[PDB]
Design a protein around this ligand. Structure first.
Ligand SMILES: [Zn+2]
Ligand SMILES: [Zn+2]
Ligand SMILES: [Zn+2]
Ligand SMILES: [Zn+2]
Ligand SMILES: [Zn+2]
Ligand SMILES: [Zn+2]
Ligand SMILES: [Zn+2]
Ligand SMILES: [Zn+2]
Length: 350
């Protein structure tokens, strides 16, 4: 593959530096998909990684959940300006009577935390949590990355469509995106393709159960399926409704520095410097609260994602028809993901 030398040049050093057991890389250029596979999906057995290997993608799941929400909007089942309680009777009489679906989707509801408190481990406790939650900031004023925030958005989006989230995604949305091997719950026939994640101590692990995990960070997919998603975000899909939904996830709602927050996807003016990309994906933007600013007025879209044993990254530029997917079974530094992707994308762009 003429592109192997280029991809290898940025990926190989990464694998060695962070002792990554395996990584599936997929690139899109001139309409064609290119696959580069490294290492193993299972260290004990030695099973090799392929573009069909299933990896946990963590927060990258939010781009798919966001697409489901956009789909609900297109179908007329809900509007982003809808108060959250309009789609959950159990939220009536809480702070969510004055918070919108869009604010939940863009982490700007007012300070919902990164993760649910450790004690919130059941449906009953989760409902109680939201009903007692007190806003920290006025709605729309600050961005505080939050799983409970986007998780609730996805949960309610599914409810607006009158179907449970998991089956809705697996039986309708994902198939519509051409993603037939993407799961919230990996089925029996696909378990053999499911890689094992590896902690810092090299222990084989997989994602732990959690409230709204399916909506916020529970997707398992392959580099082939995720690149098909990238293609859908560029070349489009056959279904008009789904196409409209995809476009909605490209719209900027507000910005934080050089990063513009949309539904799921986070975008930047293209060409973008490695410095700007690193900043938008820095700990300051990820962990702390930051005031929202007016949205950006070519564009690169991206999203990072991790689980205790996995590290994923996806970035693409529609106007140039290029994109890259990097799925690894080691949660290695986000900065390393950005640097490798930026280098490869630069070569692909010309
Ligand atoms: Zn090589
Ligand atoms: Zn090729
Ligand atoms: Zn529910
Ligand atoms: Zn199939
Ligand atoms: Zn499940
Ligand atoms: Zn402030
Ligand atoms: Zn590492
Ligand atoms: Zn050039």
């Amino acid at each position: 593959d003429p592109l192997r030398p280029v991809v290898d040049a940025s990926i190989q050093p990464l694998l060695k530096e962070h002792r990554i057991p395996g990584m599936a890389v997929a690139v899109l250029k001139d309409g064609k998909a290119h696959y580069f596979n490294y290492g193993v999906a299972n260290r004990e057995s030695g099973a090799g990684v392929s573009e069909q290997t299933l990896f946990e993608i963590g927060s990258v799941s939010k781009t798919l959940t966001a697409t489901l929400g956009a789909y609900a909007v297109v179908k007329g089942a809900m509007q982003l300006d809808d108060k959250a309680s309009r789609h959950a009777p159990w939220l009536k009489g809480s702070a969510f009577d004055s918070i919108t679906m869009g604010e939940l989707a863009t982490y700007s509801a007012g300070g919902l935390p990164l993760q649910f408190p450790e004690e919130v481990d059941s449906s009953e406790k989760m409902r109680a949590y939201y009903r007692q939650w007190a806003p920290v900031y006025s709605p729309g004023s600050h961005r505080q990355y939050s799983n409970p925030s986007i998780g609730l958005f996805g949960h309610l989006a599914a409810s607006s469509l009158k179907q449970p989230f998991a089956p809705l995604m697996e039986q309708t949305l994902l198939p519509g995106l051409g993603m037939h091997h993407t799961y919230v719950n990996v089925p029996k026939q696909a378990m053999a393709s499911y890689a094992y994640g590896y902690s810092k101590e090299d222990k084989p692990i997989r994602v732990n159960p959690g409230m709204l995990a399916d909506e916020a960070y529970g997707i398992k997919t392959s580099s082939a399926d995720l690149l098909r998603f990238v293609k859908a975000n560029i070349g489009g899909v056959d279904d008009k409704a789904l196409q409209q939904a995809i476009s909605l996830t490209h719209q900027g709602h507000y910005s934080v520095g050089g990063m513009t927050q949309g539904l799921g996807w986070e975008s930047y003016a293209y060409p973008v410097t490695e410095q700007t990309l690193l900043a938008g994906n820095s700990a300051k933007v990820i962990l702390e609260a930051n005031p929202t600013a007016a949205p950006r007025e070519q564009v690169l879209f991206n999203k990072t994602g991790s689980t205790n044993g996995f590290g994923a990254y996806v970035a693409f530029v529609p106007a140039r028809g290029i994109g890259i997917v990097m799925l690894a079974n080691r949660n290695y530094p986000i900065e390393a993901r950005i640097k490798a992707a930026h280098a490869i994308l630069a070569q692909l762009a010309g």
